[PDB]
């Protein structure tokens, strides 16, 4: 087999900026005039399309924007300038030899400008408790660097047991991230504390976002 | 226009088995190399099977050999994958694929929608549908978030819409995490502040697999 390696996985470029995707081949795939390799640009939730055949051919109606190259066991995609709708996951595909191989992808992400995230909080539903369970909902949403930190504090003591995590994939209007964070614990747990806390460390501010709910005030 | 568009996948047990189908329509089956290709969770994809114009070759990758099987009918513009013995590493979404003719084109010219594959021992399951709205002592700016928690389904996919559609542009539906065995997600909607109290806003589930479908107006507190 061939084994197809791309680096980075991911690469955050900007609006007019050149992204450069590498696909590494652990033997070579050159037969002669032709090294077949293809490239396939995947949008999330969308089937991947044709990019790039045969190393360095543009398939018709994709953007000269896109293009590709190498020989041997070192192969390259560029796109430039990047635009918005670039966002997306781009595979590159070996074809010389049986098994017909993939790379593991690369992520492009679209580099803007850091923007903070809008923090909400969400009690537990009546309707969760009356089955006897308990989850508190935290909201980080439209943010940018993906990087962050969700702290879930419990009548102020940091917890961290119960909690799931989710990010969106990069939003194709704005170029934000969004994610979700839930603490989930029993009815009872959930009732024998007072205060529940969402905090929310984005490198776009030093004071923290604190969101919070009082089980016992209103 | 090529197009391909493929069914009958679903849940299934280890050591099942199940046949999937691929149908093409904008241009000469007859003449077209066709295989599929599956992609794993971790988005890694992987050519499971293949097949010439006139059925005289077929290729499968090593871990497919001997439990699947490809075949076609050029007369209905179909694609066949047999599969048997599943193994939980065959969890994928299959997507199948057409081949540009005579090395003109790329090796894969044109993709379909996929159809999901869950090889597994966990049970079919419709989820709850609890509503996320804010504490009495909510956050009053302009816009106001909502939201609600699917949670407890098994497998993939959920689909979730607000007021059938109409919010679209300030949706944030966030991607499934797997816990004991059972899928939750969450998704939120954003309206203007003005709108929340004396207008419905109203979450729309579906959960295909169970064919279950519930929608959950979303009340104060």
């Known amino acids: 087999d061939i084994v197809l390696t791309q680096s980075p996985a991911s690469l955050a470029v900007s609006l007019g900026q050149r992204a450069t995707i590498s696909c590494k081949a652990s033997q070579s795939v050159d037969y002669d005039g032709d090294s077949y390799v293809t490239w396939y640009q995947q949008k999330p939730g969308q089937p991947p399309k044709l990019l790039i055949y045969v190393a360095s051919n543009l398939e018709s109606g994709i953007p000269a924007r896109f293009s590709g190259s190498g020989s041997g066991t070192d192969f390259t995609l560029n796109i430039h300038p990047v635009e918005e709708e670039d966002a997306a996951t781009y595979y590159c595909?070996?074809?010389?030899?049986?098994?017909?191989?993939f790379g593991g992808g690369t992520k492009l992400e679209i580099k803007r400008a850091d923007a903070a995230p809008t923090v909400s909080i969400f009690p537990p539903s009546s309707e969760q408790l009356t089955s006897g369970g308990a989850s508190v909902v935290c909201f980080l949403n439209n943010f940018y660097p993906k990087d962050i930190n969700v702290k879930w504090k419990i009548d102020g003591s940091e917890r961290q047991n119960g909690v799931l995590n989710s990010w969106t994939d990069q939003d194709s209007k704005d170029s934000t991230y969004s994610m979700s964070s839930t603490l989930t614990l029993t009815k009872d747990e959930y009732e024998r504390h007072n205060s529940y806390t969402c905090e929310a460390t984005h490198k776009t501010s030093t004071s923290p976002i604190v969101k919070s709910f009082n089980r016992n005030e209103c | 226009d090529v197009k391909l568009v493929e069914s009958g996948g679903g849940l299934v047990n280890l050591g099942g088995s199940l046949k999937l189908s691929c149908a093409a329509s904008?241009?000469?089956?007859?003449?077209?190399?066709m295989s599929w290709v599956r992609q794993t969770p971790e988005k890694r994809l992987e050519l499971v099977a293949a097949?010439?114009?006139?059925?005289?070759?077929?290729y499968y990758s090593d871990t497919v050999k001997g439990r699947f099987t490809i075949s076609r009918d050029n007369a209905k513009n179909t694609l066949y994958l047999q599969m048997s013995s599943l193994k939980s590493e065959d969890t994928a979404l299959y997507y199948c694929?057409?081949?540009?003719?005579?090395?003109?084109?790329?090796?894969?010219?044109?993709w379909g929608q996929g159809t999901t594959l869950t090889v597994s021992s966990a049970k079919t399951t419709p989820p709850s549908v609890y509503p996320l709205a804010p504490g009495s002592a909510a956050q009053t700016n302009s816009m106001v978030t909502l939201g609600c928690l699917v949670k407890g389904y098994f497998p993939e996919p959920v689909t979730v819409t607000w007021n059938s559609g109409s919010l679209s542009s300030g949706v944030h539906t966030f991607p499934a995490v797997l816990q004991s065995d059972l899928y939750t997600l969450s998704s939120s909607v954003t309206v203007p502040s003005s709108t929340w109290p004396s207008e419905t806003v109203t979450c729309n589930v579906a959960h295909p697999a169970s064919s279950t479908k519930v929608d959950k107006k979303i009340v104060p507190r």
């Open positions: 694929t057409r081949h540009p003719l005579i090395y003109h084109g790329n090796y894969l010219d044109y």
């Open positions: 595909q070996q074809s010389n030899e049986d098994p017909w191989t």
């Open positions: 904008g241009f000469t089956f007859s003449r077209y190399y």
């Open positions: 097949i010439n114009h006139n059925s005289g070759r077929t």
